[PDB]
Design a protein around this ligand. Structure first.
Ligand code: DK7
Length: 393
């Protein structure tokens, strides 16, 4: 049965890449002010540059919006490395390649920042799609998506198809290239192959999930499953890498090194800091293992697995000489804040944030990078016992 794509107006509305983020075009204010906004499932504030910055070519000008409302309150958001200081307000917001609706939403006008804006990313703001619990200053600041659902007939769901190119893109290349899709209010069936498998959203704060088993080329990492979710496991479009808890990262890297041992790489490569290059077209994908993350299913005692390739966890980067070599960074790194299923993982799949049914769907992406021998996979069911015990308290 042929799968039909019913959300053509929202298909291909994203641009960007895993390293600098995926963004969607939005307008704020009256008359509309066009801004490129980073799509972030790992935070809950909608904020835009609202003052000059060396990395900003445009920003929100509140004095030019007739519909701007001042909330007379400051707001501060600290991320993993970046942070910003802003002024709260509300204004009319639209997504030109989104639903044909305009909503009044909370907007944090960024006045000061540190390592937030990325030089040449082409985005000027952030769209925090997660829940009110993690919004700053507190959970009374209604996130954008909650406003959107409350004010319109848009269903309480969005889905993301993040499309990694498999090769580097310069600033002009990301501007001219399609980066993927953000389908607001539905599931577009042309964006995936095979079946959608659903994992429950453990708690509505981050998009929190439970990992029950981890495999490197079919080999069980054999850790107590609590370790995989210590202190939580989240699906995060706003983080580049697959980030793993310290103990899990150390076990995974030992296994990935063992599986790829026909070639030796410097410590800086495994630390995710140093690039590794191969002659054009000769990347030895086959020496690197596949990685399987088993997720709690919706049916009691049932799990399913998502499998990524090195085409996902090896992030394409440009060489210092901009040569013809194919270069990459190891996009798996240590975390002190739980598992982070970042953009490099999401690039393998069509990810459904079904807020209505408190679940996250995964299916093989129609735009995942692969080779003629292996593809990413979403498979199940597996009989897995005491999966609730994997959750950390
Ligand atoms: C890389 C990165 O920081 N990605 C960010 C988004 C983000 C992207 C970016 F390109 C620059 C930046 F400064 C921030 C993402 O939100 C991460 C942030 O860390 C974790 O969330 C912490 C949470 C605490 C309460 C306030 C909201 C954030 C997990 N999610």
């Amino acid at each position: 049965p042929g799968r039909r794509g019913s959300f053509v107006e929202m298909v291909d509305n994203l641009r960007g890449k895993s390293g600098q983020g995926y963004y969607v075009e939005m307008t704020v204010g009256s008359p509309p002010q066009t801004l490129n906004i980073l799509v972030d499932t790992g935070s809950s504030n909608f904020a835009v540059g609202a003052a000059p910055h060396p990395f900003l070519h445009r920003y929100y000008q509140r004095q030019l919006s007739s519909t701007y409302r001042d909330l007379r309150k400051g707001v501060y958001v600290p991320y993993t490395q970046g942070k910003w200081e802003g002024e709260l307000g509300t204004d009319l917001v639209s997504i030109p390649h989104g639903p044909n609706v305009t909503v009044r939403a909370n907007i944090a006008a960024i006045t000061e920042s540190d390592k937030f804006f990325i030089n040449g990313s082409n985005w000027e703001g952030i769209l925090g799609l997660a829940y009110a619990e993690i919004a700053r200053p507190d959970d009374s600041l209604e996130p954008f998506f909650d406003s959107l659902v409350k004010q319109t007939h848009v269903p309480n769901l969005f889905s993301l198809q993040l499309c990694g190119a498999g090769f580097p893109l310069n600033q002009s290349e990301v501007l001219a290239s399609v980066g993927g899709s953000m389908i607001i209010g539905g599931i577009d069936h042309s964006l995936y192959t095979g079946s959608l498998w659903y994992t429950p959203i453990r708690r509505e704060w981050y998009y929190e999930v439970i990992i029950v088993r981890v495999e490197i080329n079919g080999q069980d990492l054999k850790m107590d499953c609590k370790e995989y979710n210590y202190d939580k496991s989240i699906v995060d479009s706003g983080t580049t890498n697959l980030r793993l808890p310290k103990k899990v990262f150390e076990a995974a890297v030992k296994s990935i090194k063992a599986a790829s041992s026909t070639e030796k790489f410097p410590d800086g490569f495994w630390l995710g800091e140093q690039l590794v290059c191969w002659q054009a077209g000769t990347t030895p994908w086959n020496i690197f293992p596949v990685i399987s993350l088993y997720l709690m299913g919706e049916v009691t005692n049932q799990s399913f697995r998502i499998t990524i390739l090195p085409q996902q966890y090896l992030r394409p980067v440009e060489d210092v000489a901009t040569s013809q070599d194919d270069c990459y960074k190891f996009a798996i790194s240590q975390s002190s804040t739980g598992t982070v299923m970042g953009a490099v993982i999401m690039e393998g799949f069509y990810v459904v944030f079904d807020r209505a049914r408190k679940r996250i769907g995964f299916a093989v992406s129609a735009c995942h990078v692969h080779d003629e021998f292996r593809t990413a996979a979403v498979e199940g069911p597996f009989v897995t016992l005491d999966m609730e015990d994997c959750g950390y308290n």
